[PDB]
Amino acid sequence: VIESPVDVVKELVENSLDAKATKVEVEIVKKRLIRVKDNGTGIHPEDVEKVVEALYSISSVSKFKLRSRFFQEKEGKEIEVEAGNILGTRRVGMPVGTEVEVRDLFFNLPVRRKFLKKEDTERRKVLELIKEYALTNPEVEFTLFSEGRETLKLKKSSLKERVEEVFQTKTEELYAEGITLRAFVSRNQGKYYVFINKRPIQNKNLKEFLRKVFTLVVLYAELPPFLELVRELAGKEKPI
Ligand SMILES: Nc1ncnc2c1ncn2[C@@H]1O[C@H](COP(=O)(O)OP(=O)(O)O)[C@@H](O)[C@H]1O
Ligand SMILES: [Mg+2]
């Protein structure tokens, strides 16, 4: 579950969205620090200690803090853990929501730490991950700071606006329908994103076929628990 900083960011941002955050803020350093802040419902003080599953596995491999203020409470609570060992808790003043800081990832596993990829490779994986969450959560604001610079800022918007902000280009929206397809295509620019029932799909069979029938292609597929309709979809661009 936890091999590198991107895996940490994934689990934390998933937890923020699970807690119906509308603003998710991520900061990474070098790794050295992963911080995820959200304005979701928070965690009751009586449950903060319990959560140390994904947070257990993260806290046992880092110098870990989690602070959270429950929507019903005036104060937050903070728990601090090192490599799975609880170091203490504290009352803290904070806004409603949750902030998790993961420091010195794999400090307790120096071989695993020395085999991590260079900072710039880890950075790009976290950048791509946050783009992927932003593409399926257009109602959510996302910010990413890396090495102290605000490298990604996406405000709440329509899906088409959110696609266009992410990829910095104008798109044409295509549609074809128990099976539903919605794509956004931009032709000059090649990148082929696929979301099946709101989840990111990396399948090679699908990206090659999007390459073959289209270019930037962002495909949102909704299916009950195909490639024909995609090529049917590819013919639906307006004449000009
Ligand atoms: N950002 C957050 N906001 C609210 N609750 C959180 C947050 N992060 C974690 N939690 C709480 O901690 C629990 C454990 O998180 P986790 O270890 O990721 O397991 P899981 O999310 O699969 O239940 C969650 O069920 C949720 O109750
Ligand atoms: Mg979780």
Q: What is the 3-state secondary structure (H, E, C) of the chain?
A: CCCCHHHHHHHHHHHHHHCCCCEEEEEEECCCEEEEEECCCCCCHHHHHHHCCHHHHHHCCCEEEEEEECCCCCCEEEEEEECCEEEEEEEECCCCEEEEEEECCCCCCHHHHHCCCCHHHHHHHHHHHHHHHHHHCCCCEEEEEECCEEEEEECCCCHHHHHHHHHCCCCEEEEECCCEEEEEEECCCCEEEEEECCEEECCHHHHHHHHHHCCEEEEEEECCCCHHHHHHHCCCCCCC
Ligand 1 atom closest to Cα of residue 54: 17
Do 174 and 233 touch, CB atoms closer than 8 A? yes
Give the number of domains in the chain: 2
53 lines ligand 1 (CB under 6 A): yes
Of the residues 14, 37, 51, 99, which should be mutated to test ligand 1's pocket, given the most ligand atoms within 8 Å of the CB? 51
Of the residues 9, 18, 52, 77, which should be mutated to test ligand 1's pocket, given the most ligand atoms within 8 Å of the CB? 18
Q: Are 41 and 126 members of one domain? A: yes
Q: Are 142 and 237 members of one domain? A: no
Angle CA 169–221–170, to nearest 5 = 10
Q: Which residue has the least CA distance to atom 9 on ligand 1?
A: 15
Residue-number span of the structural domain to which 41 is assigned = 1-169
Of 152, 169, 186, the domain-final residue: 169
Listed resolution, Å: 1.7
Q: Which residue has the least CA distance to atom 21 on ligand 1?
A: 15
Q: Checking DSSP bridges between strand 97-103 and strand 33-38, what pairing results, if any?
A: antiparallel
At 28, list the tokens: 């990474």
Measured distance CA(23)–CA(95) in Å, rounded: 12
Measured distance CA(214)–CA(107) in Å, rounded: 46
Measured distance CA(65)–CA(231) in Å, rounded: 49
Q: Are 164 and 177 members of one domain? A: no
Question: Quick count: other Cβ atoms within 10 Å of Cβ 139?
Answer: 10
Of 169, 196, 211, the domain-final residue: 169
Ligand 1 centroid distance, CA of 196 (Å): 24
Q: Which residue has the least CA distance to atom 14 on ligand 1?
A: 51
Ligand 2 centroid distance, CA of 15 (Å): 5
* Cβ-based neighbours of 208, under 8 Å, separated by 6 or more: none
At 179, list the tokens: 């099976």
43 lines ligand 1 (CB under 6 A): yes
Q: Are 38 and 152 members of one domain? A: yes
Measured distance CA(194)–CA(57) in Å, rounded: 29
Q: Are 175 and 234 members of one domain? A: yes
Q: Are 46 and 113 members of one domain? A: yes
- Residues after which the chain is discontinuous, using a C–N cutoff of 2.5 Å: 30, 52, 177, 189, 214, 225
Q: Are 5 and 112 members of one domain? A: yes
Do 97 and 40 touch, CB atoms closer than 8 A? yes
Q: Are 139 and 222 members of one domain? A: no
Q: Are 42 and 114 members of one domain? A: yes
Cross-sheet strand order for the sheet of 191-196: 172-176, 180-186, 216-222, 191-196, 199-201
Q: Are 155 and 183 members of one domain? A: no
Of 169, 185, 220, the domain-final residue: 169
Q: Are 138 and 184 members of one domain? A: no
- Which ligand is closest in space to the CA of residue 71? 1
